[PDB]
Amino acid sequence: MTTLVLDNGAYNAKIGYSHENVSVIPNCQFRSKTARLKTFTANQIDEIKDPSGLFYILPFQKGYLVNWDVQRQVWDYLFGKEMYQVDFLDTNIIITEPYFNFTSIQESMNEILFEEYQFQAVLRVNAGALSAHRYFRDNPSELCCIIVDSGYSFTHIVPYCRSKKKKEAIIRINVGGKLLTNHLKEIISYRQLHVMDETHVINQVKEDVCYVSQDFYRDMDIAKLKGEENTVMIDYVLPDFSTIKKGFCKPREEMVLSGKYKSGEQILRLANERFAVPEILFNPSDIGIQEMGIPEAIVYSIQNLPEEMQPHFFKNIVLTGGNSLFPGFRDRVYSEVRCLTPTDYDVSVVLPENPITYAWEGGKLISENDDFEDMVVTREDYEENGHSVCEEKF
Amino acid sequence: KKVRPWKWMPFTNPARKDGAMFFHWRRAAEEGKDYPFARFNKTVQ
Amino acid sequence: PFYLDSLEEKRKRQRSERLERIFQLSEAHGALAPVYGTEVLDFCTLP
Amino acid sequence: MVEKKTSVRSQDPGQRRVLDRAARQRRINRQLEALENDNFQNFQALLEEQNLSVAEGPNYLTACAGPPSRPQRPFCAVCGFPSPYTCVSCGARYCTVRCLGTHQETRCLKWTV
Amino acid sequence: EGEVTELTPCTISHVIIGLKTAKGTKQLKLDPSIFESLQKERVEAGDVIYIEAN
């Protein structure tokens, strides 16, 4: 039989069955100021011929849930067609849950899942736990691993050892991809005008041009010196949905250094943001937050009890999420943890080759674990125990 | 950046069987789209 | 979990290097003797 | 000769005033809350209901990372480049006199209400 | 050679010092006679130092 693996958050709602449906389906609804205020669903955004000024209705604005209505509408619109083949009791679903989520909200979500959609089985596995299982299956010779999941709206430093997570050296950081996108928005707004509040185009510009600087102060000096010499001043032409529907970074050759083009686009752009907005993950607190970076917590998480886990912990660092898509992020994290951790202890940091849907891969690989029928809680068990069997099983 | 002219576009109603062609001031986005009121064709049983 | 053979061997080898370093330094810090000596200077020195 | 009509919105230096600590902290908190938010330039009630039943233990409170060891770097608020200076009025940082002027014209004490 | 991360003298049997470079961190046990040199050089957490074993 097939199963439906579901990961959910503020930016993305990745659902997928045993074989296909691998994509970046969002979780929020979109309202177009121009399309008569029509309320679009996760994948219906593709039907919008002009995503400029889309109002986002979010079930999650950060790690926790809000306004069930939106989540249930998204789930219904997804199931209603090819995505899941609404058949309910024929298959089962496996949903992820945040590191420390609302106990009441999560048990009520399980209640709704058992009652309304009536999946024959569902469980309380954790988003980090699924990635931990994936990594353990990839490397059976390993016994302990730390997951740095820097999602688009998440930053979790989660340990795992002996197939059990400890709730003491477990760190979360509020510096997420959404914060980075909002900071880029505010910077562009402040440096081109006094107000600018579009989100959809800048969220793409983020992943298109931003990169993690391997030498922050060197890049800062290169940006401080005049643009005639710097290389990070790559200009980005924004989309207008009338001549080009998707923005793009102009070739290094076509760049007119005067910053003005007779074509008439909003190409205006600066170099600083490109490498300033990603480094907030590594060296935060520059803007004012009391939030700590990635590496110091990657360190703090290791040195609690075990001198036998500490070495395996350094050797097994699993960087995943969505914020690890910028080039140089892996190298920077590796250099930082290598310079922060003891020399004698080995430190191996390896990000996968295609970690765009690592959670879906873990789910599709667990689909044939021959123990899911025991890991999962079923309809009758739920109805009889009343959330107790669900709290027991994860 | 303004490109979306309203046009006096022809259209056909799938609910009809004679293929009669009518006209309407449609937008520049839903050209050739199905007739929205076509749902109102549930004749009595 | 179990320990690492490579890690424990590296620990042993760095400890051996440490022991060799003490053996070298202790022997090098006492190679030369005084020209006159503390007691010789104290005997030669008058009030 | 054409008479150039001047503006009357100029403010008296005798009336202009310096800022304080609480208001600067509120500025910082508002800026961070806006950076965390996503809408025109609610989860507040969400976190209120959350903290309604929070205690000390393995939870969000004891899970937050906290402040780092490396000291805060003085980045600019206008252009973002390293800012060795500060604004005597509000404390904002800058790197050039042009940046200071832009701050005084667009940011200095105009959003605090 | 490297940046100091911690100084702890154990009337002193030795001093444990933490050094940092771009190859990892190192914990070092120095004779109490070198703790005098450390105090005289006024080194503290965050300063880069050379300490010759010889």
Side-chain angles (χ1 to χ4, degrees), chain A residues 35-319:
Chain A
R36 296 182 175 181
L37 298 171
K38 182 179 175 185
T39 303
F40 292 87
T41 329
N43 79 315
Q44 298 182 356
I45 183 170
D46 299 330
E47 303 179 1
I48 313 181
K49 301 183 183 301
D50 186 4
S52 179
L54 287 170
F55 182 91
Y56 288 69
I57 313 182
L58 296 151
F60 313 69
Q61 307 191 261
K62 48 189 163 186
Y64 303 151
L65 177 62
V66 171
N67 188 11
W68 286 271
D69 298 0
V70 182
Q71 157 274 0
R72 56 171 53 267
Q73 289 177 61
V74 172
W75 288 13
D76 297 359
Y77 275 68
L78 292 164
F79 302 153
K81 63 180 65 176
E82 298 291 353
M83 287 69 168
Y84 177 63
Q85 289 296 330
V86 177
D87 300 1
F88 290 129
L89 291 164
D90 297 64
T91 58
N92 50 25
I93 187 177
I94 147 167
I95 293 168
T96 68
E97 61 90 33
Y99 68 115
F100 285 119
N101 188 24
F102 264 88
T103 59
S104 300
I105 298 181
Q106 199 59 48
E107 62 79 13
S108 60
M109 183 61 63
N110 296 118
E111 179 189 0
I112 294 167
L113 194 288
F114 278 109
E115 294 292 354
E116 301 184 4
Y117 308 91
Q118 57 172 0
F119 289 81
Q120 72 89 226
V122 60
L123 75 188
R124 185 55 180 282
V125 287
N126 180 273
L130 298 184
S131 295
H133 186 78
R134 175 73 179 109
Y135 177 77
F136 289 140
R137 215 204 69 167
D138 291 326
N139 307 268
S141 60
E142 303 297 349
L143 303 175
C144 175
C145 145
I146 205 170
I147 303 182
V148 183
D149 184 4
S150 61
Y152 281 94
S153 310
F154 307 88
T155 302
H156 304 313
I157 314 301
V158 196
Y160 287 100
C161 185
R162 199 174 66 181
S163 301
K164 181 180 179 181
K165 80 297 189 178
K166 297 188 177 183
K167 304 176 184 178
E168 297 182 0
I170 168 57
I171 292 169
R172 188 263 159 81
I173 321 186
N174 297 263
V175 186
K178 291 185 68 57
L179 274 74
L180 303 186
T181 307
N182 295 333
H183 195 60
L184 179 59
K185 289 164 53 175
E186 293 292 353
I187 290 166
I188 299 173
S189 180
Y190 258 132
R191 298 178 189 173
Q192 306 306 143
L193 232 176
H194 92 271
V195 57
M196 179 275 293
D197 57 74
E198 90 82 33
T199 300
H200 192 260
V201 170
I202 287 156
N203 181 87
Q204 303 180 54
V205 180
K206 179 183 70 177
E207 299 294 351
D208 292 0
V209 297
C210 298
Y211 78 95
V212 187
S213 57
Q214 294 182 351
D215 193 353
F216 178 78
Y217 272 94
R218 178 166 54 86
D219 294 9
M220 276 295 181
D221 300 0
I222 292 170
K224 287 167 61 57
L225 57 77
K226 193 58 172 293
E228 297 294 352
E229 299 295 350
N230 62 6
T231 306
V232 299
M233 197 177 182
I234 298 297
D235 300 70
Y236 184 93
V237 195
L238 303 173
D240 61 6
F241 314 114
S242 56
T243 62
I244 22 68
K245 298 178 179 179
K246 184 178 181 180
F248 63 96
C249 58
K250 242 184 186 298
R252 181 70 184 186
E253 294 72 0
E254 301 180 1
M255 305 202 316
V256 177
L257 304 182
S258 67
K260 299 180 180 180
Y261 296 69
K262 297 180 178 180
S263 55
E265 288 66 358
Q266 294 72 0
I267 187 170
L268 289 177
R269 236 293 307 278
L270 295 178
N272 181 275
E273 299 85 353
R274 191 185 181 183
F275 71 94
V277 303
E279 246 287 350
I280 304 175
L281 299 166
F282 294 80
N283 294 119
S285 71
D286 54 353
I287 303 301
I289 57 275
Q290 276 60 227
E291 295 295 350
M292 197 232 65
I294 322 186
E296 289 76 357
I298 288 170
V299 171
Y300 230 95
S301 297
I302 313 313
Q303 288 60 239
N304 10 265
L305 223 304
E307 309 296 348
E308 47 269 347
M309 281 69 158
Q310 174 162 14
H312 292 168
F313 255 129
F314 291 145
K315 292 177 65 58
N316 303 326
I317 280 171
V318 180
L319 288 162

Side-chain angles (χ1 to χ4, degrees), chain D:
Chain D
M1 298 180 179
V2 182
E3 300 181 1
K4 226 173 186 178
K5 186 176 182 179
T6 59
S7 180
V8 300
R9 307 300 301 275
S10 299
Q11 297 299 328
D12 179 10
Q15 304 301 338
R16 298 204 296 272
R17 189 181 65 268
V18 295
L19 238 287
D20 61 71
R21 171 54 150 276
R24 288 166 187 174
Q25 183 61 26
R26 286 189 285 93
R27 266 183 166 276
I28 296 171
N29 295 332
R30 182 203 292 177
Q31 188 174 13
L32 300 185
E33 183 176 357
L35 292 173
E36 176 278 346
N37 189 21
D38 185 5
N39 253 323
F40 306 148
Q41 179 179 352
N42 52 23
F43 223 101
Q44 180 59 19
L46 184 288
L47 285 187
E48 286 175 0
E49 299 178 0
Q50 197 277 338
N51 181 87
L52 180 146
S53 60
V54 166
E56 291 294 352
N59 53 24
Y60 193 1
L61 273 283
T62 63
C64 67
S69 300
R70 198 276 248 275
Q72 167 168 0
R73 284 291 83 192
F75 289 1
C76 169
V78 176
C79 56
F81 295 107
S83 54
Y85 311 113
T86 51
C87 186
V88 173
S89 56
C90 69
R93 310 200 67 96
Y94 55 93
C95 66
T96 55
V97 181
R98 301 178 181 179
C99 300
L100 172 56
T102 54
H103 169 79
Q104 291 183 358
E105 291 178 0
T106 62
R107 298 161 177 78
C108 190
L109 319 191
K110 301 194 178 187
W111 310 117
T112 44
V113 169

